Design an enzyme around this catalytic site. Sequence first.
Site, PDB file in Angstrom:
ATOM      1  N   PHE A  96       0.844  -1.179   0.000  1.00 15.56           N
ATOM      2  CA  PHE A  96       0.000   0.000   0.000  1.00 15.56           C
ATOM      3  C   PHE A  96       0.891   1.243   0.000  1.00 15.56           C
ATOM      4  O   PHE A  96       0.726   2.122  -0.844  1.00 15.56           O
ATOM      5  CB  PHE A  96      -0.938  -0.004   1.215  1.00 15.56           C
ATOM      6  CG  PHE A  96      -1.599   1.334   1.435  1.00 15.56           C
ATOM      7  CD1 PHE A  96      -2.235   1.990   0.397  1.00 15.56           C
ATOM      8  CD2 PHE A  96      -1.531   1.971   2.660  1.00 15.56           C
ATOM      9  CE1 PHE A  96      -2.802   3.245   0.584  1.00 15.56           C
ATOM     10  CE2 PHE A  96      -2.107   3.219   2.840  1.00 15.56           C
ATOM     11  CZ  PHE A  96      -2.718   3.858   1.800  1.00 15.56           C
ATOM     12  N   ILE A  97       1.816   1.331   0.961  1.00 18.20           N
ATOM     13  CA  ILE A  97       2.599   2.560   1.081  1.00 18.20           C
ATOM     14  C   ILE A  97       3.602   2.678  -0.064  1.00 18.20           C
ATOM     15  O   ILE A  97       3.774   3.758  -0.631  1.00 18.20           O
ATOM     16  CB  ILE A  97       3.287   2.704   2.455  1.00 18.20           C
ATOM     17  CG1 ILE A  97       2.241   2.769   3.562  1.00 18.20           C
ATOM     18  CG2 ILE A  97       4.203   3.920   2.458  1.00 18.20           C
ATOM     19  CD1 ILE A  97       2.767   2.892   4.950  1.00 18.20           C
ATOM     20  N   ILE A 123      11.134  -6.772  -9.003  1.00 20.27           N
ATOM     21  CA  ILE A 123      11.910  -7.985  -8.763  1.00 20.27           C
ATOM     22  C   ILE A 123      11.157  -8.804  -7.726  1.00 20.27           C
ATOM     23  O   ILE A 123      10.941  -8.341  -6.612  1.00 20.27           O
ATOM     24  CB  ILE A 123      13.348  -7.671  -8.305  1.00 20.27           C
ATOM     25  CG1 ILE A 123      14.123  -6.863  -9.340  1.00 20.27           C
ATOM     26  CG2 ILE A 123      14.070  -8.959  -7.929  1.00 20.27           C
ATOM     27  CD1 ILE A 123      15.480  -6.393  -8.853  1.00 20.27           C
ATOM     28  N   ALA A 152       7.421  -6.383   5.327  1.00 20.10           N
ATOM     29  CA  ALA A 152       7.174  -6.843   6.681  1.00 20.10           C
ATOM     30  C   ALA A 152       5.895  -7.677   6.694  1.00 20.10           C
ATOM     31  O   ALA A 152       5.123  -7.645   5.733  1.00 20.10           O
ATOM     32  CB  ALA A 152       7.023  -5.670   7.616  1.00 20.10           C
ATOM     33  N   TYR A 210       4.688  -8.605  17.104  1.00 22.34           N
ATOM     34  CA  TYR A 210       4.885  -7.671  16.006  1.00 22.34           C
ATOM     35  C   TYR A 210       5.691  -6.454  16.471  1.00 22.34           C
ATOM     36  O   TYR A 210       6.717  -6.119  15.894  1.00 22.34           O
ATOM     37  CB  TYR A 210       3.545  -7.226  15.411  1.00 22.34           C
ATOM     38  CG  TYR A 210       3.621  -6.061  14.466  1.00 22.34           C
ATOM     39  CD1 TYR A 210       4.264  -6.176  13.238  1.00 22.34           C
ATOM     40  CD2 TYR A 210       3.030  -4.841  14.779  1.00 22.34           C
ATOM     41  CE1 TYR A 210       4.334  -5.092  12.370  1.00 22.34           C
ATOM     42  CE2 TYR A 210       3.083  -3.760  13.915  1.00 22.34           C
ATOM     43  CZ  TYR A 210       3.705  -3.905  12.684  1.00 22.34           C
ATOM     44  OH  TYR A 210       3.827  -2.870  11.804  1.00 22.34           O
ATOM     45  N   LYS A 264       9.709  -5.242  15.256  1.00 22.03           N
ATOM     46  CA  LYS A 264      10.001  -3.958  14.660  1.00 22.03           C
ATOM     47  C   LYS A 264      11.089  -3.252  15.444  1.00 22.03           C
ATOM     48  O   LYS A 264      11.954  -2.614  14.845  1.00 22.03           O
ATOM     49  CB  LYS A 264       8.702  -3.140  14.568  1.00 22.03           C
ATOM     50  CG  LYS A 264       7.755  -3.534  13.457  1.00 22.03           C
ATOM     51  CD  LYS A 264       8.377  -3.393  12.091  1.00 22.03           C
ATOM     52  CE  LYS A 264       7.362  -3.241  10.984  1.00 22.03           C
ATOM     53  NZ  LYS A 264       8.093  -3.117   9.692  1.00 22.03           N
ATOM     54  N   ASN A 292      -1.404   4.428  12.053  1.00 19.34           N
ATOM     55  CA  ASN A 292      -2.172   3.696  11.051  1.00 19.34           C
ATOM     56  C   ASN A 292      -2.694   4.626   9.954  1.00 19.34           C
ATOM     57  O   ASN A 292      -3.395   5.612  10.225  1.00 19.34           O
ATOM     58  CB  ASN A 292      -3.334   2.945  11.692  1.00 19.34           C
ATOM     59  CG  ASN A 292      -2.876   1.755  12.523  1.00 19.34           C
ATOM     60  OD1 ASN A 292      -1.791   1.226  12.332  1.00 19.34           O
ATOM     61  ND2 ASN A 292      -3.712   1.279  13.422  1.00 19.34           N
TER      62      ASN A 292
HETATM   63  N1  LIG Z   1      -0.019   1.027   6.679  1.00 19.07           N
HETATM   64  C1  LIG Z   1       0.174   1.406   7.933  1.00 19.07           C
HETATM   65  O1  LIG Z   1      -0.703   2.002   8.568  1.00 19.07           O
HETATM   66  C2  LIG Z   1       1.434   1.025   8.642  1.00 19.07           C
HETATM   67  C3  LIG Z   1       1.457   1.220  10.016  1.00 19.07           C
HETATM   68  C4  LIG Z   1       2.572   0.879  10.745  1.00 19.07           C
HETATM   69  C5  LIG Z   1       3.663   0.324  10.123  1.00 19.07           C
HETATM   70  N2  LIG Z   1       3.661   0.154   8.757  1.00 19.07           N
HETATM   71  C6  LIG Z   1       4.825  -0.471   8.127  1.00 19.07           C
HETATM   72  O2  LIG Z   1       5.062   0.209   6.933  1.00 19.07           O
HETATM   73  C7  LIG Z   1       5.529  -0.724   5.932  1.00 19.07           C
HETATM   74  C8  LIG Z   1       4.647  -0.634   4.721  1.00 19.07           C
HETATM   75  O3  LIG Z   1       3.289  -0.859   5.156  1.00 19.07           O
HETATM   76  P1  LIG Z   1       2.154  -1.267   4.149  1.00 19.07           P
HETATM   77  O4  LIG Z   1       0.846  -0.902   4.750  1.00 19.07           O
HETATM   78  O5  LIG Z   1       2.417  -0.756   2.776  1.00 19.07           O
HETATM   79  O6  LIG Z   1       2.189  -2.872   4.215  1.00 19.07           O
HETATM   80  P2  LIG Z   1       1.758  -3.863   3.041  1.00 19.07           P
HETATM   81  O7  LIG Z   1       1.423  -5.152   3.691  1.00 19.07           O
HETATM   82  O8  LIG Z   1       0.796  -3.233   2.109  1.00 19.07           O
HETATM   83  O9  LIG Z   1       3.132  -3.977   2.224  1.00 19.07           O
HETATM   84  C9  LIG Z   1       4.206  -4.819   2.661  1.00 19.07           C
HETATM   85  C10 LIG Z   1       4.682  -5.603   1.474  1.00 19.07           C
HETATM   86  O10 LIG Z   1       5.753  -6.471   1.892  1.00 19.07           O
HETATM   87  C11 LIG Z   1       5.697  -7.641   1.121  1.00 19.07           C
HETATM   88  N3  LIG Z   1       6.403  -8.684   1.831  1.00 19.07           N
HETATM   89  C12 LIG Z   1       5.988  -9.343   2.956  1.00 19.07           C
HETATM   90  N4  LIG Z   1       6.844 -10.217   3.395  1.00 19.07           N
HETATM   91  C13 LIG Z   1       7.909 -10.113   2.516  1.00 19.07           C
HETATM   92  C14 LIG Z   1       9.102 -10.856   2.381  1.00 19.07           C
HETATM   93  N5  LIG Z   1       9.466 -11.801   3.222  1.00 19.07           N
HETATM   94  N6  LIG Z   1       9.893 -10.595   1.312  1.00 19.07           N
HETATM   95  C15 LIG Z   1       9.531  -9.614   0.482  1.00 19.07           C
HETATM   96  N7  LIG Z   1       8.401  -8.908   0.463  1.00 19.07           N
HETATM   97  C16 LIG Z   1       7.636  -9.194   1.527  1.00 19.07           C
HETATM   98  C17 LIG Z   1       4.219  -7.915   0.906  1.00 19.07           C
HETATM   99  O11 LIG Z   1       4.038  -8.621  -0.292  1.00 19.07           O
HETATM  100  C18 LIG Z   1       3.648  -6.496   0.787  1.00 19.07           C
HETATM  101  O12 LIG Z   1       3.565  -6.034  -0.553  1.00 19.07           O
HETATM  102  C19 LIG Z   1       5.614  -2.094   6.633  1.00 19.07           C
HETATM  103  O13 LIG Z   1       6.920  -2.215   7.181  1.00 19.07           O
HETATM  104  C20 LIG Z   1       4.573  -1.934   7.738  1.00 19.07           C
HETATM  105  O14 LIG Z   1       4.812  -2.733   8.878  1.00 19.07           O
HETATM  106  C21 LIG Z   1       2.550   0.470   8.011  1.00 19.07           C
HETATM  107  O1  LIG Z   2     -16.146  -2.677  13.639  1.00 19.10           O
HETATM  108  C1  LIG Z   2     -15.168  -2.724  14.379  1.00 19.10           C
HETATM  109  C2  LIG Z   2     -13.804  -2.790  13.955  1.00 19.10           C
HETATM  110  C3  LIG Z   2     -12.835  -2.819  14.876  1.00 19.10           C
HETATM  111  N1  LIG Z   2     -13.098  -2.836  16.232  1.00 19.10           N
HETATM  112  C4  LIG Z   2     -12.004  -2.846  17.215  1.00 19.10           C
HETATM  113  O2  LIG Z   2     -11.181  -1.730  16.955  1.00 19.10           O
HETATM  114  C5  LIG Z   2      -9.790  -2.072  17.220  1.00 19.10           C
HETATM  115  C6  LIG Z   2      -8.965  -1.844  15.982  1.00 19.10           C
HETATM  116  O3  LIG Z   2      -9.237  -2.910  15.049  1.00 19.10           O
HETATM  117  P1  LIG Z   2      -8.573  -2.916  13.594  1.00 19.10           P
HETATM  118  O4  LIG Z   2      -9.362  -3.864  12.760  1.00 19.10           O
HETATM  119  O5  LIG Z   2      -8.334  -1.517  13.144  1.00 19.10           O
HETATM  120  O6  LIG Z   2      -7.157  -3.628  13.897  1.00 19.10           O
HETATM  121  P2  LIG Z   2      -6.069  -3.639  15.067  1.00 19.10           P
HETATM  122  O7  LIG Z   2      -5.597  -2.157  15.198  1.00 19.10           O
HETATM  123  O8  LIG Z   2      -6.705  -4.151  16.345  1.00 19.10           O
HETATM  124  O9  LIG Z   2      -4.996  -4.527  14.462  1.00 19.10           O
HETATM  125  C7  LIG Z   2      -9.827  -3.520  17.761  1.00 19.10           C
HETATM  126  O10 LIG Z   2      -9.924  -3.554  19.192  1.00 19.10           O
HETATM  127  C8  LIG Z   2     -11.100  -4.077  17.129  1.00 19.10           C
HETATM  128  O11 LIG Z   2     -11.605  -5.143  17.904  1.00 19.10           O
HETATM  129  C9  LIG Z   2     -14.395  -2.813  16.712  1.00 19.10           C
HETATM  130  O12 LIG Z   2     -14.672  -2.842  17.913  1.00 19.10           O
HETATM  131  N2  LIG Z   2     -15.350  -2.727  15.751  1.00 19.10           N
END
Ligand SMILES: NC(=O)c1ccc[n+]([C@@H]2O[C@H](COP(=O)([O-])OP(=O)(O)OC[C@H]3O[C@@H](n4cnc5c(N)ncnc54)[C@H](O)[C@@H]3O)[C@@H](O)[C@H]2O)c1
Ligand SMILES: O=c1ccn([C@@H]2O[C@H](COP(=O)(O)OP(=O)(O)O)[C@@H](O)[C@H]2O)c(=O)[nH]1
Lengths: 321, 316, 318, 306
Positions: free
Chosen positions: B18-19, B58, B83, B152, B156, B181
């Site tokens: 996503f990011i 890749i 991750a 998790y 990290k 998030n």
């Molecule tokens: N989206 C958020 O809100 C959020 C929040 C906190 C931390 N992060 C961190 O930011 C980063 C990007 O987040 P995101 O939401 O885009 O996650 P995402 O799950 O969309 O993207 C992660 C990607 O990593 C790839 N991947 C997983 N395991 C792998 C491996 N062993 N080898 C190679 N590729 C692998 C997956 O295919 C996926 O495309 C991650 O490190 C995530 O933990 C994101």
């Molecule tokens: O309709 C919903 C969706 C989520 N949650 C709660 O909101 C928090 C955040 O859930 P999310 O799915 O965002 O993931 P998490 O941050 O827990 O990984 C958790 O305690 C869920 O149980 C909830 O009560 N109702």
Amino acid sequence: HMIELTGKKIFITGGAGFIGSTLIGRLIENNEMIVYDNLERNTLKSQPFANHKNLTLIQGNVLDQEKIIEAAKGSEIFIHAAAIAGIDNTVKSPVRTMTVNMIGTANALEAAHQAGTVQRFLEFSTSEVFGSRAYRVDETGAVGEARWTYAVSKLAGEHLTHAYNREHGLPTVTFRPFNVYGPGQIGEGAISIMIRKALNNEDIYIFGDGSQIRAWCYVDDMIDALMKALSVPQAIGESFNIGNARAITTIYGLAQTICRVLNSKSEIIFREALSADIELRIPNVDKSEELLGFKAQVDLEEGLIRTADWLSANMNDLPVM
Amino acid sequence: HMIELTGKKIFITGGAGFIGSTLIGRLIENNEMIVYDNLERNTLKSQPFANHKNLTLIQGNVLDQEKIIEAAKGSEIFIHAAAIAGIDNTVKSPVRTMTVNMIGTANALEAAHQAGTVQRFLEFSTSEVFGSRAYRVDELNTGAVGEARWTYAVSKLAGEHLTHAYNREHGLPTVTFRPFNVYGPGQIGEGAISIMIRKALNNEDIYIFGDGSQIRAWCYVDDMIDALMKALSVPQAIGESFNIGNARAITTIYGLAQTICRVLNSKSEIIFREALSADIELRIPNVDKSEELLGFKAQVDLEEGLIRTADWLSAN
Amino acid sequence: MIELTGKKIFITGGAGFIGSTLIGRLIENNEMIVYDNLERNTLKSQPFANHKNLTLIQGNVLDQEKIIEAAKGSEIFIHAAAIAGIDNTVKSPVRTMTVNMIGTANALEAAHQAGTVQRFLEFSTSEVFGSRAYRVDELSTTTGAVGEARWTYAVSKLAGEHLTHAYNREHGLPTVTFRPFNVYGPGQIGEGAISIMIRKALNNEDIYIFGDGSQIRAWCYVDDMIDALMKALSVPQAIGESFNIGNARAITTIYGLAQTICRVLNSKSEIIFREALSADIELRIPNVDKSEELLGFKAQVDLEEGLIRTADWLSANM
Amino acid sequence: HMIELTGKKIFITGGAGFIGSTLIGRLIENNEMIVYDNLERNTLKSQPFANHKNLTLIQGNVLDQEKIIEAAKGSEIFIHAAAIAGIDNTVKSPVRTMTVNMIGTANALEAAHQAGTVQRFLEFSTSEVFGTGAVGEARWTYAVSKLAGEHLTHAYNREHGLPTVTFRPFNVYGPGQIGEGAISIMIRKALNNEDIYIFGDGSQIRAWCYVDDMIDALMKALSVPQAIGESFNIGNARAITTIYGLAQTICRVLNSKSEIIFREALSADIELRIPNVDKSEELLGFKAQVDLEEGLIRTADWLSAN
Ligand SMILES: NC(=O)c1ccc[n+]([C@@H]2O[C@H](COP(=O)([O-])OP(=O)(O)OC[C@H]3O[C@@H](n4cnc5c(N)ncnc54)[C@H](O)[C@@H]3O)[C@@H](O)[C@H]2O)c1
Ligand SMILES: O=c1ccn([C@@H]2O[C@H](COP(=O)(O)OP(=O)(O)O)[C@@H](O)[C@H]2O)c(=O)[nH]1
Ligand SMILES: NC(=O)c1ccc[n+]([C@@H]2O[C@H](COP(=O)([O-])OP(=O)(O)OC[C@H]3O[C@@H](n4cnc5c(N)ncnc54)[C@H](O)[C@@H]3O)[C@@H](O)[C@H]2O)c1
Ligand SMILES: NC(=O)c1ccc[n+]([C@@H]2O[C@H](COP(=O)([O-])OP(=O)(O)OC[C@H]3O[C@@H](n4cnc5c(N)ncnc54)[C@H](O)[C@@H]3O)[C@@H](O)[C@H]2O)c1
Ligand SMILES: NC(=O)c1ccc[n+]([C@@H]2O[C@H](COP(=O)([O-])OP(=O)(O)OC[C@H]3O[C@@H](n4cnc5c(N)ncnc54)[C@H](O)[C@@H]3O)[C@@H](O)[C@H]2O)c1
Ligand SMILES: O=c1ccn([C@@H]2O[C@H](COP(=O)(O)OP(=O)(O)O)[C@@H](O)[C@H]2O)c(=O)[nH]1
Ligand SMILES: O=c1ccn([C@@H]2O[C@H](COP(=O)(O)OP(=O)(O)O)[C@@H](O)[C@H]2O)c(=O)[nH]1
Ligand SMILES: O=c1ccn([C@@H]2O[C@H](COP(=O)(O)OP(=O)(O)O)[C@@H](O)[C@H]2O)c(=O)[nH]1
Ligand code: NA
């Protein structure tokens, strides 16, 4: 189930080192023992039992995942003692400390898991894990940063150890010795330095205000704990702090104890510290008592004398400044 | 060491997610970009720039140390986003989460170091690192969800530790980036905001599991991308760690549901139900350093960001 | 153990909001003496203000001789006299510390000398726990005026708790420590965030959120607090114990509270962020599980219902 | 704004005890001094200056609000040392400890406030403040009763501008008192080659301040304007040690043949953290000069002679 420490295949990463050499001396008569070690240190080669028929030396790096998997096959007791712990080593190369300690532990866990035969996995961590929590990557001197680096490298290994225990039922035991002293230790830690100075009535210098705390464990106490940890079923899934509650002291108090117990005339002198350190709190040792039935029996006076005896007996084998 | 984000060779582990996908959209016109990802997720493919001439995919695993070292040769900006963050997956396999996150990060750092050409190494951590200090590995009993979240978080934090070592020892120009998030257009999503907006828009019941008092911090996508651009460019970022988010978008789950239903003029009921699993309590960190050093302050608050997100969700 | 009928009840601060409310529930079946300086007076507005079972003594809890005298023969002693002044224009930490710390000492001692007390209930506050993370010698524009006044209040109550414990342990005074989360509901206009936001919302006036709005506050509906109080005053296992009295479902951020209020009351009020007037401190909300387990208390009025009951009372009374 | 400690009217609650007597001895020649004490303790009556022309003894309780207010009238330096302190006194009654220490400080503060003349109010606290039998109960009670006094002191400084100094000594030792502490008992035993008992694992930290250092600190705090509104940790950073370490130090320094023997404690250890003393150096220009070796010897000399 209770494990009897005879007729076992015992695999020890880091087994060439101090603790591993010590445990081998105690178990080699009755067990097959395989050391997996890259011989960064080799205490083992200088022991009576280095060439015992039951002893095997595999030269290998715990960062070599393939090689550790093969070497560990069939093993029944897996002891993970390979690590880098040196402060100065960690100042210079924090990456090697982190990597060897974190990834080496992953690799050792995986090897043990894949063997399928392991009845006990014993993971050596460190006491500084406890103190380390009140510091932050985000936030001391070179010594402090290196000690933190060490502590968090070992904490990461505990996390991995937990995951294997939880996911795979690997029968793990986390074993965190207080700083071990006693006969066998060459080393350049405070006890060995201060005994050696005190014996010759040389000045002992205290770096800093002398109020910094260090906890110790006598070698034979650590070994008795380790035999219990390796054997009793209540150890499994558990973490233990291994030391002596009566052997927690300040560095100034340690110098006074040593000089008193050895009837030394050494003068004790305060110097400026060479580097800021981090202050870590000493953990409780009660759970080791409760579950292992372990309570340290060698208090400082006895331990220091036995140590001074061995140092004097063996006075041709080191030198420092 | 101010980096201009054009004409660069950019390498992104986890770049198909996503990011990564979102950041590529913003940089692909003016940069050579390489994605290294095993395609556990693949948002990138759905994008209109999926086949841009400037983009190479890749397919590889960050656990494959040889392949990632090779793939990263010549890279000038290295972004480690790969991750495992899934709670349910981490319940089932905590070893896989720990391994991919810790060892994948070790391998990413080594690949960047070996390349010798990296001007900025940005590692994605996570905000829950701060909360996790409250807990003790030898104390966990947390519920399944809480032990998974802790697992998790510590995976990290180990990554951050490695990152620090490489910076200090080898001068690798690192930046640790902890997004709150992320929500908004482009995440269809599966977390609370996405689920709750979709419910609210169709006047469906929103169930609150447990007492609703659990805190969650959020960041609107465009704010996170803006911060990332600052972190990738500005010299003050080097050697620092940043909490990336909006201090006005920290709320309880019950509070979030109320906010979503009011802002969208929904007729949804919000209804308490039993929790399925206990969770860990996490404190949200401060975002002040990000303002001081990156010049970043999030501009999109929940009212605006929830409406923008709902518009997108409706249109799709 | 204790049946709340036919008892001689002595309540410091009995003219106030919680005291008044509790008097409504007990005055029919109990002889009640209110000891209060009338800094506040909710009691005078209540239907039972002039009841045959009620005696008012206008007195100060800092007048050690008077309270000892007034308290003679009491079987249930309820110490509710306190001030806070957290949000007040004129800050008086001395007043808060002396009234709360010394007032509590004088109340405990009055209870102890009467010899007749079967239950001593002391009101403390949930903030005592968080207070331990701050240090008197390290208070800054970090803390701000409101922060420092909140800390003052919290440590003044913590001292009262220590006093209460000492009397329990030394003299076997049968004490209960009762820590209400912030109480809202019918019976008073109030100056807290719920009252102020409800009055704005009912008139579609703009609601302002000071700082980033992520500050957490925990709320307890008045009827729930009184139910807990009745149980704490009666049940044997309450003695020698302390209780956190709240609703786990009514812990939210100030922004989330605003949103809840506007949605529940069908308001068109805008909710707008503004810079805080003063820096505040952050204090943890303690767990309430022991209260359930030992008292058999669990709060039953959640925010949506509570806010409607409050808004109705406010509309009918203005 | 620097205060000169001559020609002042000095009012000392608790002035009849150890620290109060000691201070009176240093100041009595050159100041008018009023001791306000109920004589739970009375070191002062044993001193050659007990009947000095500049000393007035008022026998009074700091719980008597009206009396202390009257007595403190016109005071220029107000030293609040009255407390139930020392385990001999504190173990007697948690209520009396909490009440005398907390309420007594409130009253002392109100007396200083009403006087209008106080240029320095010095409140003695204890270093335990930022750390279940009768004994552990009395120590906990002491600590929180002292921390409550610090809170009231803060309130008065903030609201009324009262020129307060919170003064937190480590455990004071030295000549002029047999004493009741670890140092006292262990030296006595060591001098006789009597065995020293360690109750528990002996890991308990204790920090110390030599009496003469404490007095030098007190003089700086009473005079220097940077002291106002501050709180100070008063002790020696090199004289922090474990109880076992202290026993070893005493025996070695005095060349004793005493054995040091572990014995059971049914009590649980109190792991008190020991505060930092840097602020005292920076603001008061105070750094402890008598380290343990030297202090122990001077103590042993006094104990021997007597
Ligand atoms: N989206 C958020 O809100 C959020 C929040 C906190 C931390 N992060 C961190 O930011 C980063 C990007 O987040 P995101 O939401 O885009 O996650 P995402 O799950 O969309 O993207 C992660 C990607 O990593 C790839 N991947 C997983 N395991 C792998 C491996 N062993 N080898 C190679 N590729 C692998 C997956 O295919 C996926 O495309 C991650 O490190 C995530 O933990 C994101
Ligand atoms: O309709 C919903 C969706 C989520 N949650 C709660 O909101 C928090 C955040 O859930 P999310 O799915 O965002 O993931 P998490 O941050 O827990 O990984 C958790 O305690 C869920 O149980 C909830 O009560 N109702
Ligand atoms: N001795 C103590 O006081 C103490 C205190 C706390 C923790 N521990 C831990 O106990 C264990 C044993 O300690 P020790 O004192 O015997 O240390 P040691 O240094 O004597 O033994 C460690 C051994 O590991 C080997 N080794 C190092 N890197 C390796 C690698 N990459 N692959 C394979 N082998 C490698 C070394 O050659 C050495 O023989 C270590 O994990 C140490 O951190 C010891
Ligand atoms: N209401 C809440 O949300 C809340 C929250 C936490 C704790 N508490 C505590 O519960 C108790 C009662 O709260 P309340 O809401 O009824 O407050 P309140 O202010 O309405 O009542 C307290 C009463 O004490 C009286 N009083 C104050 N100082 C006095 C003194 N020196 N001498 C004699 N009487 C004096 C006042 O006149 C008042 O009637 C107090 O201890 C308060 O700290 C209340
Ligand atoms: N001596 C130390 O090592 C040490 C350490 C930390 C703190 N302190 C503090 O320093 C101050 C002086 O210590 P000290 O060793 O001289 O103590 P002390 O016990 O020798 O002196 C206290 C004095 O207060 C008097 N007193 C007790 N209760 C009284 C009451 N209700 N009204 C009036 N007077 C009363 C006693 O008669 C005694 O003379 C105290 O506040 C003590 O808590 C001392
Ligand atoms: O002769 C000595 C040896 C050590 N130390 C101090 O005692 C502590 C313990 O040192 P050691 O060599 O045992 O190693 P460390 O525990 O610091 O890794 C450190 O603060 C050292 O500076 C000292 O003051 N004098
Ligand atoms: O219209 C309002 C009223 C209050 N507050 C905030 O809501 C919190 C609770 O305010 P309250 O008046 O209940 O008192 P407090 O709990 O702060 O003593 C504080 O951070 C206030 O600044 C707010 O943002 N808007
Ligand atoms: O020779 C001694 C003197 C003291 N202590 C321990 O230290 C505690 C406090 O001793 P101290 O005489 O310093 O008491 P205080 O001055 O605090 O009243 C005792 O209860 C013992 O546990 C000890 O073990 N041996
Ligand atoms: Na008044």
